Scaffold this active site. Structure first.
Site, mmCIF file in Angstrom:
data_model
loop_
_atom_site.group_PDB
_atom_site.id
_atom_site.type_symbol
_atom_site.label_atom_id
_atom_site.label_comp_id
_atom_site.label_asym_id
_atom_site.label_seq_id
_atom_site.Cartn_x
_atom_site.Cartn_y
_atom_site.Cartn_z
ATOM 1 N N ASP A 183 46.260 41.812 31.313
ATOM 2 C CA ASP A 183 45.049 41.872 30.519
ATOM 3 C C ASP A 183 44.403 43.231 30.806
ATOM 4 O OD1 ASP A 183 41.766 40.698 31.015
ATOM 5 O OD2 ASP A 183 42.689 40.843 29.020
ATOM 6 N N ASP A 243 41.665 37.653 33.792
ATOM 7 C CA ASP A 243 40.357 37.217 34.287
ATOM 8 C C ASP A 243 39.616 36.322 33.301
ATOM 9 O OD1 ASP A 243 37.866 39.601 33.305
ATOM 10 O OD2 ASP A 243 39.797 39.245 32.379
ATOM 11 N N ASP A 298 43.456 34.138 29.043
ATOM 12 C CA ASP A 298 44.637 34.459 29.847
ATOM 13 C C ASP A 298 45.265 33.187 30.410
ATOM 14 O OD1 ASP A 298 44.329 37.235 29.446
ATOM 15 O OD2 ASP A 298 42.963 37.423 31.152
HETATM 16 MG MG LIG Z 1 39.835 40.174 30.665
#
Ligand SMILES: [Mg+2]
Ligand SMILES: *[C@@H]1O[C@H](CO)[C@@H](O[C@@H]2O[C@H](CO)[C@@H](O)[C@H](O)[C@H]2NC(C)=O)[C@H](O)[C@H]1NC(C)=O
Ligand SMILES: CC(C)CCC[C@@H](C)[C@H]1CC[C@H]2[C@@H]3CC=C4C[C@@H](O)CC[C@]4(C)[C@H]3CC[C@]12C
Ligand SMILES: *[C@@H]1O[C@H](CO)[C@@H](O)[C@H](O)[C@H]1NC(C)=O
Ligand SMILES: [K+]
Ligand SMILES: [K+]
Ligand SMILES: [Tl+]
Lengths: 39, 992, 268
Positions: free
Chosen positions: B345, B686, B690
Site C-alpha cells: 500500500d 494500514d 488492505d
Molecule cells: Mg494506506
C-alpha cells in the site's frame, strides 16, 4: 596384602559421588556466570 | 465460494430519485411505514454481519497429536502397554518398565502437542472489526417522523439521515444533501473528505457523489438517503466476508517441517519393520520382537526436535519485539525471510499520510523543503527577504490551528483542526519561523474572504505588525494561474518589479515541474494598500469588493504532497538488493501513485511506461513496443476488464509495477496473481482496504500507529512504531533463522545414530544391551535441548542480504545433504565412541570384547546367578546388570562428550570456528549445563533407581574424547575443502 | 536414478568405503590399546563381584523347584542341571599329580601358590570328590540341593570368629577353617541335612585363593550338598540358605548375594 587384601574388592563410591556432585554444581554456576554476561 | 466477492460491484446510482423508490417501495419524504419496515426486516434479515464458522480449539489441539512423530510415539506408547499386558498375564512381572515407559511416551506426545499448537496459532477477528464500524443506532424517517432505531433494524428502502460525526449505517442512495462531506478511506485508503450530493457524477458507483457507503463516516454537513444495501450485501460487508472467509493456508516454514517429518518418519518405519522381521527370522519371540521395536521407535524419532524449532522461533520473535515489531503468528517469523515479492500500500505505509510542503518557487528559483518526519534533511533558504514575505502569507492567509495541549509532541506529528493544505502550510511556517500564533497576533486580521468554489482564492487583510506603518496589508492564496491573473509586480529578492513575459514563462515552467512531481501547487501574493486611500479606521466589506484584488504583487509558489516516510526509500532499495520484487498497490490516483513510486525507488531512474515512450517520441501508444517498457502503471478501471492470464502477463513482463486506484478485491487479485507464479508474497498496509490482501498474503504486515484495527487483525506482524526499516530487519532475521534451524536440526538428528546402532548390534551380535530406552530420552529430552536451542543465536556466516530469496521448491530445510552428514558421517563416529566406552566398561570389569558375542542369552537369564567372565569369575544376576547399566550411563555420557564437538561444528555450515569464533554465550551455556545435567544424572543418589543411571569412574568420562576430537577435525577439514573450492563436490554432497 | 547419476553414485560409494574402512581401522586401534592396558591373569576392577554370590544346581524356574514325587518326568528337569554340575567333579577328570593335588580330607587353611604370575606353570588345584557329598538319579522325594560359592580371583573367604553370639550358636564351630552355610525358613516344617568336605556344613579354606581361569584351568571349587527330608507335603516352603563370613554381605536387591532363595514344593 596377602590374606588381608580386602581393599582389592572395595571402591569409594561415596567420595566419587560427593566429588561428582561438587563438579556438577560448579559447572552449573560457571554456566550461569557466562550466560548472565548480558542476560 | 468467494469468487463472486472478488468481482467489482453493480449499483443503482444511475436511476432517478423517484425511480429508485419504485425499486424499494419507498417514500422520498415520508419514508417507510412501521409495518412495511418490519415486513422487510423479516424478509431480508438484519442489517448485521455474521462471523464465519470457526474450527474449535479442541480439534485444533488433537490434529497435532497425529503428525508423523506423534503417530510413531503413539505406536510406541501402546506397544509398551501391549508388552506389559502380555507380561501381566503370562509370568507375573512385578516390574514397572513397559507400564511407566508407556506413560512417559504418552506424556511426550501431549506436551509436544502443546508446542506445535502454540506454533500453529491463528489470532483472527476480522469480522469483529468490521462489525465495530456499524453504529449502534441510526436515524430514519418512518411515517413522516424521524426516530433513532437499532441500526440492525435498518432495511432496504427506508429514509436515513446522517450528519457530521456519524457512521454511515448502510449503503445509501443520496437524495438530499447540504455541505455533506464523507471519509471514504475505508474503500480507498485516502482520508480526504469527499462531497456527497444527489446528482450522479460518475458511471463508477465507487466514485460517484450520490452514493454513501457502510464502513465510512460523515465528516461534515447533513444528508438524507435511501438504503439500497444492508448487512452482508453492502459493498464493504462483502469485503468483510471476503476477508474473514479467505482460507488461511500453510506457511513456507510449516511446509518445511512436514517435509522432514516425512523423511525421518520414512526411515523410522523402514528400519522399524526391517529389523522387526530380521529379528523373527533370527528366532526372536514376539514378546521380545515388540520390545526391540519400541526401542527402534524411540531411537529414530527425535523426541525434542519439534519443540526446539518452536523455541528457536519464539526466541527470534522476542528479539523482533524489542525492535517494535510484534509477531502475532510464530511462523511469520520466517516467511519474511523467504519473501520474493512485496505488495505495498502507499498511503500510511510508504507515506506518512500527511499533506506536507515539498517545494517553494520564489526569486525565480525552485527550493526544496524537508518532508521527513524527524526532519533528517537540510535548510533551503532563510536569507531572502522574499521568503519572509511568502512565509507571512502562508501564516496569515491560513485558518488552521493546532489542537490544545500538543506542545509536548513534535510539530509535524501534532493534530490540526483544518483542511490538509492549510495544516501543511501551518506546520511549514511553524517549523522554520517559530510560533505561527505569534505572527497572527502581531498582524491582527480585520477582514477575510474564505476560499470560495467560484473565487478559487482566499484573501485576508491584516494590520501590519510594523510600527512605522501599522497600516493594512492584503494577502491571498489560491490556484496558481488565478493568482497570476491578479498580479502586476513580483517580489524579487526583496524589491518589487514589473511582471514581464519572461518571469511569467518561468512561472509556467516552475508550475509544470512541481505539478509533474505529483504535487499540489498553490499561488501566493500580497498587496500593501495605499495609506492615504485607507485610514486607520477604514472599513472593509468582505461581501462586496470594497478593495482592489488586481495589480497585486506575486510573491511565490508552494507545492505539497503526502511524502514518503524517511526510512522508506532506503528500505525499498535494500529489499531490491536482496532480490525482492517491490510492487505498489494503492487506492490512490495514478499521478500521485507514480510520483511516490519514483520517490521511494519502486520505479528506478530512466525506466519508462508505454505512455512515457509515446509522449517522449510523440507517437501513438499502439505504435510503441510494450516490451521496451519495463515499468507500468495500471489503473483499477482497466484492471477490471483484464483476465487473470493477462494480469499474469503484466506481472511477468514488468520489473517495476504500480497498481493504482485499486479496490480491496483488486489488491487480493494482484496478491493471488503473484502467488500463482510460485512466489512467496508479503503485503504491507494500514487501511481496511488492505484487509483481504493482508489475509491472503503469505505474511501480512500492518502499521501499528497509523494502522486501522481491521488491518492489524488481518496481519501476521505489526510494526508498532511504523518503522518501515523493520521489513528489512525482518527479512534478514527470517533468513538467519532458516539457516540456524538447519544447524539445530542436524545437531539433533546426529545423535539419533548412536541411539539406533546399539539396538541393531544387540540383535545381530547377541551382546548385552549397550544403551537403554530411558537413556535415549535423557538425551533428546534432556542434554541435547539447550545446546540445540542455542544454535538459534548464531550470527550470519556471510552477508545474507546479498543473496537471492530461497527457491521454496528446491531449497529445503532438510535435504539429502543434511542426512548424509548427520546420519552417514558424524552420527556414525558418535556411535563408535559410544560402543568403545561400552567395551571399556565391560572389559575392565572382566568381560573382554571377544567373549561378549552371543552371551545375551545367558546374560539376560534371570535364573543364572553365576555367569562366567573372561577371567573365570562368577556373577549373579543383579551384579552384572549394575555393570550393564553403568554401560548405559557411560554410553549416554559418551553421546554428551561427542555432542560437544558436534555443537561446535554445527555452529557453522561453511566458515571455520577459527573465523566465526565462540561469541555465542547461550551455546557455551549449553555446553556447561549439558555436562552439569549428565554429571548430576550419574552421581545423584537415587537416580540408579528412577533412571538406571550409575556413577561413572573418572577415567570413564574420557573414553569418547578421541572420537569427539576426530569429529572436530574431520568437519573442519571438510569445510576447509568447501571454501577452498566452490566447485561442488564436497559442497553438493554435504553443504546442509 | 533416485538421487544422482552413475558417476555420482560411484563416487559416493568410493567415499563411504574408504571412510567406514578408516573408522573401522580406528575403532580397532582403540580396542588394541585398551587390551594392551589389561592383565591376562587378573581383571582391572573387582568391586562389582566383591561380595560373593551363592548359586545352586537346581535350575529354578523363578527361585523355585516344585514337582511331584508320584511322577517321573516331574523332576527330570532339575536332575538335568544337577547332573551337569556333578559330572564335572568326576574322578576320571582328576588324574595324575598334574594339575591336581591331594589336599587335607579335613577343612584346612589357605594355600598360596605365589603371585598372579606366569613365572610358574598351571597353579595346582585341590582335588574334590563328589563322594564327599553323601546321599547325593537324585532325590526323587525331598530334594538334595547343591550349593556353591561364586569364584573370585584372589578372594580369601574369612569365617566369623566365635567372639560373640552366632545363629548356629557354637555348634561344630571349626572357627579357623570353615565358611558355614545354614539354611532356614517360625515356619519350621522341614529337616535340614548338610553334606560336604570333612563332613562339615561349609567350604574348606584350602581351595583358596582362586588364581583365575588363565592360571588355574580344571580348578575345582568346593561344593556343599543340602538335603531337605521335610516331613511336610503339598505346600510352598520358602527356604533361604545363608553363608556367614567377614567378607560376606547381602543386599535387598541382589537376592543371590551370599544367599539362596528356594521355593520347594513336593506336590505329590
Ligand atoms: Mg494506506
Ligand atoms: C561323570 O560321572 C558320571 C556318574 O554318573 C558318569 O555317568 C556314567 O555314565 C555311564 C554311561 O552313560 C553309565 O554307564 C554309568 O552308570 C554312569 N556312572 C558311572 C559312575 O560310571 C559320566 O559319564 C561321567 N562323565 C564323564 C565326562 O566322565
Ligand atoms: C549400522 C550400519 C551397518 C548402517 C550403515 C548405513 C549406511 C549404509 C547409510 C547411512 C546413511 C546413508 C546415506 C544417507 C544419505 C545419502 C544421500 C542420498 O542422496 C543418497 C543415499 C545416501 C548416500 C545414503 C546411503 C546409505 C547410508 C550411507
Ligand atoms: C543316605 O544313604 C545312606 C546309605 O548311603 C543311608 O544309610 C541313609 O539312610 C540315607 N539317609 C537318609 C536321611 O535318607
Ligand atoms: K496472511
Ligand atoms: K537425537
Ligand atoms: Tl531419538
Amino acid at each position: 596384602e596377602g590374606p588381608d587384601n580386602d581393599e582389592r574388592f572395595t571402591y569409594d563410591y561415596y567420595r566419587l559421588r560427593v566429588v561428582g556432585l561438587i563438579v556438577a554444581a560448579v559447572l552449573c554456576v560457571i554456566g550461569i556466570i557466562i550466560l548472565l554476561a548480558g542476560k | 465460494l468467494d469468487e463472486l466477492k472478488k468481482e467489482v460491484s453493480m449499483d443503482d446510482h444511475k436511476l432517478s430519485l423517484d425511480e429508485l423508490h419504485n425499486k424499494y417501495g419507498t417514500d422520498l419524504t415520508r419514508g417507510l411505514t412501521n409495518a412495511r419496515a418490519k415486513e422487510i426486516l423479516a424478509r431480508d434479515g438484519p442489517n448485521s454481519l455474521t462471523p464465519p464458522p470457526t474450527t474449535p480449539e479442541w480439534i485444533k489441539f488433537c490434529r497435532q497429536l497425529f503428525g508423523g512423530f506423534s503417530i510413531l510415539l503413539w505406536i510406541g506408547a501402546i506397544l509398551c502397554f501391549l508388552a506389559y499386558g502380555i507380561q501381566a498375564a503370562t509370568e507375573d512381572e512385578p516390574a514397572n518398565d513397559n507400564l511407566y515407559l508407556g506413560v512417559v511416551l504418552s506424556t511426550v506426545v501431549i506436551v509436544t502437542g502443546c508446542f506445535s499448537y502454540y506454533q500453529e496459532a491463528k489470532s483472527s477477528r476480522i469480522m469483529d472489526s468490521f462489525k465495530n464500524m456499524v453504529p449502534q443506532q441510526a436515524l430514519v424517517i418512518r411515517d413522516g417522523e424521524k426516530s433513532t432505531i437499532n441500526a440492525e433494524f435498518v432495511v432496504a428502502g427506508d429514509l436515513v439521515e446522517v450528519k457530521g460525526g456519524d457512521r454511515i449505517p448502510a449503503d445509501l442512495r443520496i437524495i438530499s444533501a447540504h455541505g455533506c462531506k464523507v471519509d471514504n478511506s475505508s474503500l480507498t485508503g485516502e482520508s480526504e473528505p469527499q462531497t456527497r450530493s444527489p446528482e450522479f457524477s460518475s458511471e463508477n458507483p465507487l466514485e460517484t457523489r450520490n452514493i454513501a457507503f457502510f464502513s465510512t463516516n460523515c465528516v461534515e454537513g447533513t444528508a438524507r438517503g435511501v438504503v439500497v444495501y444492508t448487512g452482508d450485501r453492502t459493498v464493504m460487508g462483502r469485503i468483510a466476508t471476503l476477508a474473514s472467509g479467505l482460507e488461511v493456508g500453510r506457511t513456507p516454514i510449516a511446509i518445511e517441517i512436514e517435509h522432514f517429518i516425512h523423511i525421518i518418519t520414512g526411515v523410522a518405519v523402514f528400519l522399524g519393520v526391517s529389523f522387526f522381521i530380521l529379528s523373527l527370522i533370527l528366532g526372536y519371540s514376539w514378546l521380545e520382537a515388540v520390545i526391540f521395536l519400541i526401542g527402534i521407535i524411540v531411537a529414530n524419532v527425535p523426541e525434542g526436535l519439534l519443540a526446539t524449532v518452536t523455541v528457536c522461533l519464539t526466541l527470534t520473535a522476542k528479539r523482533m519485539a524489542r525492535k517494535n515489531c510484534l509477531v502475532k503468528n510464530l511462523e511469520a517469523v520466517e516467511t519474511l525471510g523467504s519473501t520474493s515479492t512485496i505488495c505495498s500500500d502507499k498511503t500510511g505505509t510508504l507515506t506518512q499520510n500527511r499533506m506536507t510542503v515539498a517545494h517553494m518557487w520564489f526569486d525565480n528559483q525552485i527550493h526544496e523543503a524537508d518532508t521527513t518526519e524527524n526532519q533528517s534533511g537540510a535548510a533551503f533558504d532563510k536569507t531572502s527577504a522574499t521568503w519572509s514575505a511568502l512565509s507571512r502569507i502562508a501564516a496569515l492567509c491560513n485558518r488552521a490551528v493546532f489542537q490544545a495541549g500538543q506542545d509536548n509532541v513534535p510539530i509535524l506529528k501534532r493534530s490540526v483542526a483544518g483542511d490538509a493544505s492549510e495544516s501543511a502550510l501551518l506546520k511549514c511556517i511553524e517549523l522554520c519561523c517559530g510560533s505561527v500564533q505569534g505572527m497572527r497576533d502581531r498582524n491582527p486580521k480585520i477582514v477575510e474572504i474564505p476560499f470560495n468554489s467560484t473565487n478559487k482564492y482566499q484573501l485576508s487583510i491584516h494590520e501590519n505588525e510594523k510600527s512605522s506603518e501599522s497600516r493594512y496589508l492584503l494577502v491571498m492564496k489560491g490556484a496558481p494561474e488565478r493568482i497570476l491573473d491578479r498580479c502586476s509586480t513580483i517580489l524579487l529578492n526583496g524589491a518589487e518589479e514589473p511582471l514581464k513575459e519572461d518571469m511569467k514563462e518561468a512561472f509556467q515552467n516552475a508550475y509544470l515541474e512541481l505539478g509533474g512531481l505529483g504535487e499540489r501547487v498553490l499561488g501566493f501574493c500580497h498587496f500593501a494598500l495605499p495609506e492615504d486611500k485607507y485610514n486607520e479606521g477604514y472599513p472593509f466589506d468582505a461581501d462586496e469588493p470594497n478593495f482592489p484584488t488586481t495589480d497585486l504583487c506575486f510573491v511565490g509558489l508552494m507545492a505539497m504532497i503526502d511524502p514518503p516516510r524517511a526510512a522508506v526509500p532506503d528500505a525499498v532499495g535494500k529489499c531490491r538488493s536482496a532480490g525482492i520484487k517491490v510492487i505498489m498497490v494503492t487506492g490512490d490516483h495514478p499521478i500521485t501513485a507514480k510520483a511516490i513510486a519514483k520517490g521511494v525507488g519502486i520505479i528506478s531512474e530512466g525506466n519508462e511506461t508505454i505512455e512515457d515512450i509515446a509522449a517522449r517520441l510523440n507517437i501513438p501508444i499502439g505504435q510503441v513496443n510494450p516490451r521496451d517498457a519495463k515499468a507500468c502503471v495500471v489503473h483499477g478501471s482497466d484492471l477490471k476488464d483484464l483476465s487473470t492470464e493477462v494480469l499474469d502477463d503484466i506481472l511477468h513482463y514488468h520489473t517495476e509495477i504500480v497498481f493504482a486506484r485499486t479496490s480491496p478485491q483488486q489488491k487480493l487479485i494482484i496478491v493471488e496473481g503473484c502467488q500463482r507464479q510460485g512466489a512467496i508474497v508479503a503485503v504491507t498496509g494500514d487501511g481496511v482496504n488492505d484487509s483481504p490482501a493482508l489475509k491472503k498474503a503469505d505474511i501480512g504486515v500492518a502499521m501499528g500507529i497509523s494502522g486501522s484495527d481491521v488491518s492489524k487483525q488481518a496481519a501476521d506482524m505489526i510494526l508498532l512504531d511504523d518503522n518501515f526499516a523493520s521489513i528489512v530487519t525482518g527479512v534478514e532475521e527470517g533468513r538467519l533463522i532458516f539457516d540456524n534451524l538447519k544447524k539445530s536440526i542436524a545437531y539433533t538428528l546426529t545423535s539419533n545414530i548412536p541411539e539406533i546402532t546399539p539396538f541393531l548390534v544387540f540383535i545381530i551380535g547377541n551382546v548385552p544391551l549397550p544403551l537403554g530406552t530411558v537413556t535415549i530420552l535423557c538425551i533428546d529430552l534432556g542434554t541435547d535441548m539447550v545446546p540445540a536451542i542455542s544454535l538459534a543465536y548464531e550470527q550470519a556466516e556471510s552477508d545474507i542480504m546479498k543473496r537471492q530469496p530461497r527457491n521454496p521448491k528446491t531449497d529445503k530445510l532438510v535435504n539429502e545433504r543434511l542426512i548424509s552428514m548427520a546420519y552417514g558421517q558424524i552420527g556414525m563416529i558418535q556411535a563408535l565412541g559410544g560402543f568403545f566406552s561400552y567395551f571399556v566398561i565391560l572389559a575392565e570389569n572382566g568381560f573382554l570384547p571377544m567373549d561378549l558375542i552371543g552371551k545375551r542369552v545367558r546374560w539376560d537369564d534371570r535364573w543364572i546367578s553365576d555367569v562366567e567372565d573372561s577371567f573365570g569369575q562368577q556373577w549373579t544376576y543383579e551384579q552384572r546388570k549394575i555393570v550393564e547399566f553403568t554401560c548405559h550411563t557411560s554410553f549416554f555420557i559418551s553421546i554428551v562428550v561427542v555432542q560437544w564437538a558436534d555443537l561446535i561444528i554445527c555452529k557453522t555450515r561453511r566458515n571455520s570456528i577459527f573465523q566465526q569464533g565462540m561469541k555465542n554465550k547461550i551455546l557455551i551455556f549449553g555446553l556447561f549445563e549439558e555436562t552439569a545435567l549428565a554429571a548430576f544424572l550419574s552421581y545423584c543418589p537415587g537416580t540408579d533407581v528412577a533412571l538406571r543411571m550409575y556413577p561413572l569412574k573418572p577415567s570413564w568420562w574420557f573414553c569418547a574424547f578421541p572420537y569427539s576430537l576426530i569429529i572436530f577435525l574431520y568437519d573442519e577439514m571438510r569445510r576447509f575443502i568447501i571454501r577452498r573450492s566452490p566447485g561442488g563436490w564436497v559442497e553438493q554432497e554435504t553443504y546442509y | 536414478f533416485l538421487g544422482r547419476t552413475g558417476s555420482s553414485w560411484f563416487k559416493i560409494f568410493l567415499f563411504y568405503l574408504i571412510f567406514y574402512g578408516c573408522l573401522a581401522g580406528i575403532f580397532i586401534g582403540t580396542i588394541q590399546v585398551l587390551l594392551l592396558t589389561l592383565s591376562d591373569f587378573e581383571p582391572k576392577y573387582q568391586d562389582r563381584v566383591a561380595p560373593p554370590g551363592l548359586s545352586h544346581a537346581p535350575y529354578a524356574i523363578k527361585t523355585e523347584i516344585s514337582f511331584s514325587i508320584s511322577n517321573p518326568k516331574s523332576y527330570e528337569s532339575f536332575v538335568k542341571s544337577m547332573h551337569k554340575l556333578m559330572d564335572l567333579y568326576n574322578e576320571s577328570s582328576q588324574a595324575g599329580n598334574s594339575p591336581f593335588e591331594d589336599c587335607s580330607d579335613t577343612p584346612a587353611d589357605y594355600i598360596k601358590r605365589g603371585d598372579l604370575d606366569d613365572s610358574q606353570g598351571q597353579k595346582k588345584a585341590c582335588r574334590f570328590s563328589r563322594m564327599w557329598l553323601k546321599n547325593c538319579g537324585y532325590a526323587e522325594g525331598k530334594p538334595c540341593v547343591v550349593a556353591k560359592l561364586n569364584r573370585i580371583i584372589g578372594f580369601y573367604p574369612k569365617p566369623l570368629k566365635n567372639t560373640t553370639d552366632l545363629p548356629e550358636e557354637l555348634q561344630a564351630n571349626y572357627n579357623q577353617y570353615v565358611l558355614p552355610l545354614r539354611c532356614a525358613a517360625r515356619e519350621k516344617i522341614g529337616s535340614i541335612e548338610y553334606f560336604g568336605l570333612g563332613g562339615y556344613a561349609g567350604f574348606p579354606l584350602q581351595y583358596y585363593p582362586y588364581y583365575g581361569k588363565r592360571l588355574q584351568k580344571k580348578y575345582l571349587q568346593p561344593l556343599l550338598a543340602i538335603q531337605f527330608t521335610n516331613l511336610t507335603q503339598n505346600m510352598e516352603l520358602r527356604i533361604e540358605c545363608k553363608v556367614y563370613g567377614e567378607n560376606i554381605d547381602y543386599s535387598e536387591k541382589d537376592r543371590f548375594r551370599g544367599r539362596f532363595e528356594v521355593k520347594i514344593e513336593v506336590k505329590s
